[PDB]
């Protein structure tokens, strides 16, 4: 068991004791994927308003 | 996080009014709108349901004036905002089409004017709560018409209903199965959470358990009051969790169409119940308000709220207890699907109570029941002229029968997965 | 009422343990993949030890010791006995062995040998042992044999040696009463004195060696496990260890007694309800 | 001196952050009004504590901190709490409505509305730094904000401070204090999206802390306050070297150098001892040997798992209190002959030790008794993969039926991001098994 790199100071000490040795996406890419998700939301909401508009016309026809 | 409350038709306004009688008492608000409470827990989330005196964020809707004159004359009748009574004169004749297509269509825009002025002055609108029955014509037909207009105008708010299901045992007319089947089709597409309150179960609890030989609608509605109070405790009182309508929906609804919950309450009073009794009664078929045997299906999700001063350790022990003997009855592919919440303020006249909310595939029994009664008449096209006289075609009936049989299919597949 | 699952469907022993448990009226068996169990009779391979002991409100018990493989895989066992100081290089009861390695150091100056037999040295492209040239022969028949002992290790790391061991070589199983009587008449000694002391020493030594690596004393789930040791007896009545089996079967007549001893000591010790072993 | 910025995201990150900065103030002697009587350099400095505190001309000591929550209830209690005077109103950042336990909502929908403001508030701290090292990010795996917004924030920090280090403190989800069925989903989504952006991440399993509070503090139902004060102690041991004089782990780059030889395997296991009760009437003070040995008991780990059945890639011992090197090597010597402690071959078997002589500090009136010597072990074991396997299994159970998927798709996510995230995790479990068995 060997001790190395012993460092002392007023607050304490540190050291290393050895037991045995050895044998990014750009801001635009982010921007694309975020906006492709918001498009998907709006597509879904446009579909919902579309089916609601159909329901409105059936209400008129009845 | 304000909630806008709507009550429509006879049943919707009678249960809605008891609800506001119960929670106003819990929150210290008196029949005049003035507060006389002793704790501030009573006021920390008072805004969820009340506007500042305190006036309920409530809209009262009917096609007749009868029941609303009652409400205005009953216990807390003057608590309600007079501008928020929206009604016509001719009624809907227990007829879905009159509520959804003719009579109701004439009145709906005015209702949305009151809904709009209530939403505008909301700092952060959670969404909407509707009380109504599915068997008549206003709560059913006009009620679901409102839900369609609210979703179109507020597509990104939560829509929640307390929906009373018809039953031959306590029945006003033979066309209730038609009205309910048309309504369930709407509810499956346009609500996030529906509390299925079955008049059969309410009757049986009053008869077999409470020992009431002639249960009135007021006895039935006292049970609905307690359950509605219990089921909204977390929204109205401060908790470690921040319960709101959207979090409930996210955690309770794994599949968008399967959002019909089985409520239950305990106890149905000088000996307070011990925590073991609460948890045992709560999950007892006899304590649930939809008339489905939970042992006939599997829980997808469950939320349980305990009210009063008790050992949270024994709550957890008993909650963990009950899961590890009825594990045959919770789906294994939704890990940890039982949530537990506690609140220190008990409801009036109880030191201990518990409220169950279950998303169980046993609820399919209830839709099957409606489907059989429906098919029995529709096979001979009986009583249809009441609806074709308002402009409806048979096809819309066949479509609603098909969509509800599908709903039952969907509940059945997850029960075997 | 306790809960348990079954995930080795074709284990004779825990087939019988599950049966006994049900007939208690106090144990229900769940589906393989329901996590809300007290007890797991686990698969023999890739047992998911890392998912045990994370269920709030459930004391969980399992019928295998994570890490016991080091004793039940021939390659691992030889590494353990050569390399562990508690067993020393050559501990006098394990045949000198070589583990795809050691070819060079494989002192080959009687030089017969033996899997995972010949006399000349490797074309089976596994470990290599000294075949015991001079075993002990039951007469009449000049017949070989080996000895199977069942050992149960409970959650407390108690070591339980089943008093019924089998000898497979007659009815080809010879049990202890017969074998003891033979040794007395044939050799003037007992089964306890000439053989069992060595066996109990070997079982102790192996299981105490690995105890720090597999003990579940302060773990968040608990383990027990049934082992099967196999020995050969030579002609100077010296006992040798062959292999340790981590998922053994029992002999036919003994399936009843030993599966009861498992419930008694390994299971009901942890999950109590409303001796056949020798503690080592 | 080189500054570090701390970013607290969501309820868990904010409440844990409250606990840490309170503890920092008690340890550095900074009063709730930001004054520091022992700081003789009024109005500036390049002392060690200045890594975490800037200074005003009026002598106020301000955390280099940003608090972010998508809803305002939790960060409001900091606006009005006992440390309101500590922070500049605009390092606390709140919005209108939260993410509703939904990763997609915190990341895609409600996230884009606030990401630029938060980056602006962060940039305002970075310009007050002579040589910023990087960030310490606190969040839950399980919340909508903690998972969804944090991974969004991590992406942009890589873009805006590509050369800075990013450490995480992550609260891993436990049913006995959980808040959503969908936390396994959020957990995986956010690990997948954040992995390449994080240099080193300390996972704290709520299950482990909860049981350490019941077992060693005799608290029957532990609160967040109990959980978070104990977590504050582990965090404070980990960060003590950035805030105090010393030579071990003195900057954020040294955490990666000392604990992370492979970039993706950057999840060190933290173990801490000792944890005692303040209401323990009579208590015997444990020895260096006793507390070091306690570092190898799973019951003291921040994550339950069995390090005997994996391999170490690095071990670090951080002592506070009455500890001299000789005791530590005597306790190591002895434990090496009792414990199965196996390193990977291409790594030296041994320990890095740091000792700070100031013993741990305790919140007055809290639940932790004052001790004369404590230790936090940081070790990179392959055993921590047990927690990924647990979490990925729960994810598989739900995703095989698509349960709850529609809530994420409804915010603009595609199912592909689920299976992509889950596949990255499957790769992460493989990497661990390569190195470990
Ligand atoms: N340790 C600890 N865990 C917490 C705390 N608060 C919440 N959690 C855990 O955090 C996980 C998710 O919750 P939060 O972090 O509260 O969620 P959030 O980020 O605010 O997200 P939303 O509220 O969904 O927007 C759950 O596992 C909780 O158990 C805390 O103060 N301490
Ligand atoms: N539980 C309960 N059910 C009611 C009440 N009033 C009516 N019902 C039921 O409500 C249904 C009839 O609808 P109703 O509310 O009367 O009609 P509307 O005015 O057309 O909405 C039937 O199934 C009745 O059994 C009530 O106060 N409580
Ligand atoms: O907000 C809530 C709420 C709202 C209104 C009434 C009652 C409650 C119950 C308390 C908790 C939920 C939300 C929640 C979080 N995690 C969960 C896991 C399951 Br399973 C079910 C639900 C939840
Ligand atoms: Ca008209
Ligand atoms: Ca200074
Ligand atoms: Mg009526
Ligand atoms: Mg939050």
mmCIF file with all atom_site columns, N, CA and C in Angstrom, chain A residues 15-37:
data_model
loop_
_atom_site.group_PDB
_atom_site.id
_atom_site.type_symbol
_atom_site.label_atom_id
_atom_site.label_alt_id
_atom_site.label_comp_id
_atom_site.label_asym_id
_atom_site.label_entity_id
_atom_site.label_seq_id
_atom_site.pdbx_PDB_ins_code
_atom_site.Cartn_x
_atom_site.Cartn_y
_atom_site.Cartn_z
_atom_site.occupancy
_atom_site.B_iso_or_equiv
_atom_site.pdbx_formal_charge
_atom_site.auth_seq_id
_atom_site.auth_comp_id
_atom_site.auth_asym_id
_atom_site.auth_atom_id
_atom_site.pdbx_PDB_model_num
ATOM 1  N N  . UNK A 1 15 ? -4.736  13.061 -0.610  1.00 0.00 ? 15 UNK A N  1
ATOM 2  C CA . UNK A 1 15 ? -3.670  12.137 -0.974  1.00 0.00 ? 15 UNK A CA 1
ATOM 3  C C  . UNK A 1 15 ? -4.291  10.968 -1.719  1.00 0.00 ? 15 UNK A C  1
ATOM 4  N N  . UNK A 1 16 ? -3.424  10.113 -2.237  1.00 0.00 ? 16 UNK A N  1
ATOM 5  C CA . UNK A 1 16 ? -3.825  8.994  -3.071  1.00 0.00 ? 16 UNK A CA 1
ATOM 6  C C  . UNK A 1 16 ? -3.075  7.765  -2.588  1.00 0.00 ? 16 UNK A C  1
ATOM 7  N N  . UNK A 1 17 ? -3.818  6.750  -2.152  1.00 0.00 ? 17 UNK A N  1
ATOM 8  C CA . UNK A 1 17 ? -3.254  5.500  -1.642  1.00 0.00 ? 17 UNK A CA 1
ATOM 9  C C  . UNK A 1 17 ? -3.591  4.394  -2.640  1.00 0.00 ? 17 UNK A C  1
ATOM 10 N N  . UNK A 1 18 ? -2.554  3.763  -3.198  1.00 0.00 ? 18 UNK A N  1
ATOM 11 C CA . UNK A 1 18 ? -2.694  2.760  -4.251  1.00 0.00 ? 18 UNK A CA 1
ATOM 12 C C  . UNK A 1 18 ? -2.504  1.372  -3.656  1.00 0.00 ? 18 UNK A C  1
ATOM 13 N N  . UNK A 1 19 ? -3.363  0.433  -4.065  1.00 0.00 ? 19 UNK A N  1
ATOM 14 C CA . UNK A 1 19 ? -3.302  -0.946 -3.595  1.00 0.00 ? 19 UNK A CA 1
ATOM 15 C C  . UNK A 1 19 ? -2.754  -1.934 -4.623  1.00 0.00 ? 19 UNK A C  1
ATOM 16 N N  . UNK A 1 20 ? -2.772  -1.588 -5.922  1.00 0.00 ? 20 UNK A N  1
ATOM 17 C CA . UNK A 1 20 ? -2.294  -2.415 -7.029  1.00 0.00 ? 20 UNK A CA 1
ATOM 18 C C  . UNK A 1 20 ? -2.536  -1.690 -8.355  1.00 0.00 ? 20 UNK A C  1
ATOM 19 N N  . UNK A 1 21 ? -1.569  -1.692 -9.271  1.00 0.00 ? 21 UNK A N  1
ATOM 20 C CA . UNK A 1 21 ? -1.686  -0.875 -10.504 1.00 0.00 ? 21 UNK A CA 1
ATOM 21 C C  . UNK A 1 21 ? -2.449  -1.606 -11.597 1.00 0.00 ? 21 UNK A C  1
ATOM 22 N N  . UNK A 1 22 ? -2.565  -1.014 -12.788 1.00 0.00 ? 22 UNK A N  1
ATOM 23 C CA . UNK A 1 22 ? -3.386  -1.611 -13.851 1.00 0.00 ? 22 UNK A CA 1
ATOM 24 C C  . UNK A 1 22 ? -2.630  -2.517 -14.820 1.00 0.00 ? 22 UNK A C  1
ATOM 25 N N  . UNK A 1 23 ? -3.395  -3.432 -15.429 1.00 0.00 ? 23 UNK A N  1
ATOM 26 C CA . UNK A 1 23 ? -2.909  -4.331 -16.487 1.00 0.00 ? 23 UNK A CA 1
ATOM 27 C C  . UNK A 1 23 ? -3.788  -4.235 -17.740 1.00 0.00 ? 23 UNK A C  1
ATOM 28 N N  . UNK A 1 24 ? -21.753 18.354 -31.107 1.00 0.00 ? 24 UNK A N  1
ATOM 29 C CA . UNK A 1 24 ? -23.096 18.502 -30.525 1.00 0.00 ? 24 UNK A CA 1
ATOM 30 C C  . UNK A 1 24 ? -24.070 19.142 -31.500 1.00 0.00 ? 24 UNK A C  1
ATOM 31 N N  . UNK A 1 25 ? -25.359 18.841 -31.341 1.00 0.00 ? 25 UNK A N  1
ATOM 32 C CA . UNK A 1 25 ? -26.375 19.449 -32.211 1.00 0.00 ? 25 UNK A CA 1
ATOM 33 C C  . UNK A 1 25 ? -26.287 20.972 -32.209 1.00 0.00 ? 25 UNK A C  1
ATOM 34 N N  . UNK A 1 26 ? -26.333 21.556 -33.405 1.00 0.00 ? 26 UNK A N  1
ATOM 35 C CA . UNK A 1 26 ? -26.340 23.005 -33.515 1.00 0.00 ? 26 UNK A CA 1
ATOM 36 C C  . UNK A 1 26 ? -27.637 23.573 -32.947 1.00 0.00 ? 26 UNK A C  1
ATOM 37 N N  . UNK A 1 27 ? -27.617 24.882 -32.687 1.00 0.00 ? 27 UNK A N  1
ATOM 38 C CA . UNK A 1 27 ? -28.838 25.569 -32.287 1.00 0.00 ? 27 UNK A CA 1
ATOM 39 C C  . UNK A 1 27 ? -29.916 25.491 -33.360 1.00 0.00 ? 27 UNK A C  1
ATOM 40 N N  . UNK A 1 28 ? -29.537 25.280 -34.619 1.00 0.00 ? 28 UNK A N  1
ATOM 41 C CA . UNK A 1 28 ? -30.551 25.148 -35.659 1.00 0.00 ? 28 UNK A CA 1
ATOM 42 C C  . UNK A 1 28 ? -31.158 23.757 -35.654 1.00 0.00 ? 28 UNK A C  1
ATOM 43 N N  . UNK A 1 29 ? -30.355 22.727 -35.371 1.00 0.00 ? 29 UNK A N  1
ATOM 44 C CA . UNK A 1 29 ? -30.909 21.378 -35.322 1.00 0.00 ? 29 UNK A CA 1
ATOM 45 C C  . UNK A 1 29 ? -31.951 21.276 -34.213 1.00 0.00 ? 29 UNK A C  1
ATOM 46 N N  . UNK A 1 30 ? -31.588 21.721 -33.004 1.00 0.00 ? 30 UNK A N  1
ATOM 47 C CA . UNK A 1 30 ? -32.568 21.907 -31.932 1.00 0.00 ? 30 UNK A CA 1
ATOM 48 C C  . UNK A 1 30 ? -33.803 22.644 -32.451 1.00 0.00 ? 30 UNK A C  1
ATOM 49 N N  . UNK A 1 31 ? -33.590 23.783 -33.107 1.00 0.00 ? 31 UNK A N  1
ATOM 50 C CA . UNK A 1 31 ? -34.710 24.595 -33.579 1.00 0.00 ? 31 UNK A CA 1
ATOM 51 C C  . UNK A 1 31 ? -35.613 23.818 -34.540 1.00 0.00 ? 31 UNK A C  1
ATOM 52 N N  . UNK A 1 32 ? -35.022 23.034 -35.446 1.00 0.00 ? 32 UNK A N  1
ATOM 53 C CA . UNK A 1 32 ? -35.819 22.237 -36.376 1.00 0.00 ? 32 UNK A CA 1
ATOM 54 C C  . UNK A 1 32 ? -36.735 21.267 -35.633 1.00 0.00 ? 32 UNK A C  1
ATOM 55 N N  . UNK A 1 33 ? -36.155 20.407 -34.789 1.00 0.00 ? 33 UNK A N  1
ATOM 56 C CA . UNK A 1 33 ? -36.938 19.376 -34.107 1.00 0.00 ? 33 UNK A CA 1
ATOM 57 C C  . UNK A 1 33 ? -38.020 19.976 -33.202 1.00 0.00 ? 33 UNK A C  1
ATOM 58 N N  . UNK A 1 34 ? -37.742 21.116 -32.557 1.00 0.00 ? 34 UNK A N  1
ATOM 59 C CA . UNK A 1 34 ? -38.775 21.769 -31.756 1.00 0.00 ? 34 UNK A CA 1
ATOM 60 C C  . UNK A 1 34 ? -39.929 22.227 -32.631 1.00 0.00 ? 34 UNK A C  1
ATOM 61 N N  . UNK A 1 35 ? -39.611 22.909 -33.729 1.00 0.00 ? 35 UNK A N  1
ATOM 62 C CA . UNK A 1 35 ? -40.658 23.419 -34.591 1.00 0.00 ? 35 UNK A CA 1
ATOM 63 C C  . UNK A 1 35 ? -41.395 22.294 -35.310 1.00 0.00 ? 35 UNK A C  1
ATOM 64 N N  . UNK A 1 36 ? -40.717 21.186 -35.642 1.00 0.00 ? 36 UNK A N  1
ATOM 65 C CA . UNK A 1 36 ? -41.432 20.042 -36.209 1.00 0.00 ? 36 UNK A CA 1
ATOM 66 C C  . UNK A 1 36 ? -42.450 19.469 -35.223 1.00 0.00 ? 36 UNK A C  1
ATOM 67 N N  . UNK A 1 37 ? -42.206 19.630 -33.918 1.00 0.00 ? 37 UNK A N  1
ATOM 68 C CA . UNK A 1 37 ? -43.162 19.189 -32.913 1.00 0.00 ? 37 UNK A CA 1
ATOM 69 C C  . UNK A 1 37 ? -44.348 20.144 -32.812 1.00 0.00 ? 37 UNK A C  1
#
